[PDB]
Amino acid sequence: KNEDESKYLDQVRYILKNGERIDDRTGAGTISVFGMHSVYSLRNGVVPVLTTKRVYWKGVVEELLWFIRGDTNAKHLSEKGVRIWDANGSRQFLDQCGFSDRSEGDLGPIYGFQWRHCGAEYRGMDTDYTNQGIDQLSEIIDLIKNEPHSRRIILSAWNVKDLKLMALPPCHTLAQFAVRNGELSCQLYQRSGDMGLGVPFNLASYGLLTHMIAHVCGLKTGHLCHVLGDAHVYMNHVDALQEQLKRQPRQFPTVRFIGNIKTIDDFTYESIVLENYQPMPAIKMAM
Ligand SMILES: CN(Cc1cnc2nc(N)nc(N)c2n1)c1ccc(C(=O)N[C@@H](CCC(=O)O)C(=O)O)cc1
Ligand SMILES: O=c1ccn([C@H]2C[C@H](O)[C@@H](COP(=O)(O)O)O2)c(=O)[nH]1
């Protein structure tokens, strides 16, 4: 009945069977297919959070709220128990990326900064950037509200001039939104998708963001189209993914929002309620 999660599982099956064995930039073995497309229903509250292995929902929500704040300080995420960016903000990683003058935790002008302060001069994580640069997130909300049929509703983190300053170049590269029949849909272009760890997290993240924007704009939700460039499995995840592929998906959970939420900046962890998410046991996959 959850045919959408079966699509994700079939993508993994296709990569394991047909993918090319390539060593990546780190020397890590991967199995890769270039160019994959899948569609997930977001209708009637549904968020595509995989049921065949637990997704780090606490991490998904806190990371997304941190992006929306325009925050690039890994420490602020770590303080909420979410460590997923900590390695990239470490004294070691900063020095190794030639960011020796940066304070620990400073990831540079990554997603949050690009979403809210696009084109502003980055001067470190501790600077207040209020009103500096282009607030893409507010601009796309204004387009959805005033010109819902627009073909120009794009949220991009791929700031070429800023790539050299970023801890990592964006994997979730741009998202396009569209309104049909008072339903908000999203097409996510992901240049690089780790099918084991990254992609399930990223699908949950853009599913949730589409619901949050729809809520602010008084719209229903439609679908999330997921476009992959390098759809890959790490060789060290193959046994774990073979275990997952034996499992039959359950129905995806739904999300609902509580409180008076007027703008994209008014969401809190407590305002977001995930309903009927009881996944199968987590499967450990190393970095
Ligand atoms: C999106 N993201 C950031 C991130 C940064 N660099 C990366 N680099 C690579 N090579 N691959 C990734 N998937 C990756 N992901 C994520 C998302 C989820 C988890 C995650 O589920 N972490 C679990 C631990 C999972 C585990 O490794 O056992 C946790 O409790 O923090 C980590 C990083
Ligand atoms: O949100 C994220 C962040 C990272 N990655 C994975 C994809 C790649 O395996 C790696 C990034 O390496 P490059 O594509 O930049 O080489 O991390 C994701 O899948 N999603």
Side-chain angles (χ1 to χ4, degrees):
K1 174 135 287 297
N2 188 171
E3 272 299 299
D4 287 352
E5 178 161 359
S6 288
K7 288 171 189 180
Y8 161 88
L9 298 174
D10 285 344
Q11 287 190 321
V12 175
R13 288 186 187 102
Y14 184 92
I15 297 161
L16 292 178
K17 190 188 172 190
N18 302 116
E20 295 288 330
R21 174 51 176 72
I22 60 177
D23 290 338
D24 77 6
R25 55 171 172 90
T26 75
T30 74
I31 311 167
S32 173
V33 173
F34 183 68
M36 306 192 83
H37 198 268
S38 58
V39 183
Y40 301 83
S41 180
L42 301 180
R43 289 188 162 146
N44 304 130
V46 167
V47 184
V49 192
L50 296 199
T51 64
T52 54
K53 89 158 182 36
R54 182 179 296 281
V55 173
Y56 187 24
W57 179 253
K58 169 68 172 175
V60 170
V61 177
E62 292 290 9
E63 186 200 48
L64 184 54
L65 293 176
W66 174 81
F67 287 163
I68 292 168
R69 287 178 203 119
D71 204 337
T72 61
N73 186 352
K75 291 195 180 306
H76 291 171
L77 203 50
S78 199
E79 281 161 12
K80 299 178 183 280
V82 179
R83 298 174 183 280
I84 62 175
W85 282 98
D86 283 359
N88 290 101
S90 68
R91 185 69 275 157
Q92 184 149 342
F93 191 88
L94 287 170
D95 288 354
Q96 294 182 353
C97 272
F99 302 132
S100 62
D101 285 324
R102 269 185 197 162
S103 302
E104 204 161 37
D106 196 336
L107 297 168
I110 61 158
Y111 303 98
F113 184 83
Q114 301 303 336
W115 287 11
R116 309 311 304 269
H117 307 295
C118 168
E121 183 186 353
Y122 196 72
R123 304 181 186 185
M125 66 186 185
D126 284 326
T127 308
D128 173 34
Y129 294 106
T130 302
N131 288 326
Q132 295 186 47
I134 291 156
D135 184 350
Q136 297 185 74
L137 186 50
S138 290
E139 291 286 325
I140 65 159
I141 288 165
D142 281 345
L143 279 166
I144 291 165
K145 284 179 176 178
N146 292 282
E147 191 193 337
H149 295 153
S150 176
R151 300 181 293 234
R152 300 173 172 182
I153 314 174
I154 303 292
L155 182 64
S156 181
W158 196 260
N159 182 339
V160 171
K161 192 176 190 292
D162 280 1
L163 288 172
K164 74 173 178 290
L165 300 178
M166 293 186 194
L168 298 175
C171 295
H172 46 103
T173 309
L174 69 75
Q176 183 172 186
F177 296 88
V179 185
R180 303 297 186 261
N181 308 305
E183 291 187 358
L184 182 67
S185 291
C186 177
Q187 183 153 67
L188 171 62
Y189 190 85
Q190 179 164 3
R191 67 169 180 78
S192 181
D194 162 26
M195 300 299 287
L197 195 65
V199 165
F201 190 100
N202 299 139
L203 288 173
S205 182
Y206 279 85
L208 176 59
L209 175 62
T210 306
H211 274 98
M212 291 166 67
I213 293 171
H215 182 76
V216 164
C217 296
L219 299 174
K220 292 186 170 276
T221 50
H223 298 77
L224 174 65
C225 289
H226 182 44
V227 191
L228 279 164
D230 185 345
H232 55 278
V233 173
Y234 284 95
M235 285 291 281
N236 294 160
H237 299 172
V238 168
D239 292 340
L241 281 161
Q242 292 284 33
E243 176 179 8
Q244 187 173 350
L245 286 172
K246 293 172 188 179
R247 300 176 178 182
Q248 189 186 330
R250 302 168 176 174
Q251 177 174 290
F252 281 140
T254 56
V255 67
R256 71 174 173 87
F257 305 112
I258 57 176
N260 204 338
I261 307 162
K262 295 171 181 179
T263 82
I264 196 56
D265 288 308
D266 290 334
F267 290 93
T268 65
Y269 191 85
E270 313 87 70
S271 74
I272 298 165
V273 185
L274 190 65
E275 303 173 313
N276 305 122
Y277 185 54
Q278 305 294 116
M280 297 169 180
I283 309 169
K284 264 49 185 166
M285 303 189 198
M287 206 83 137

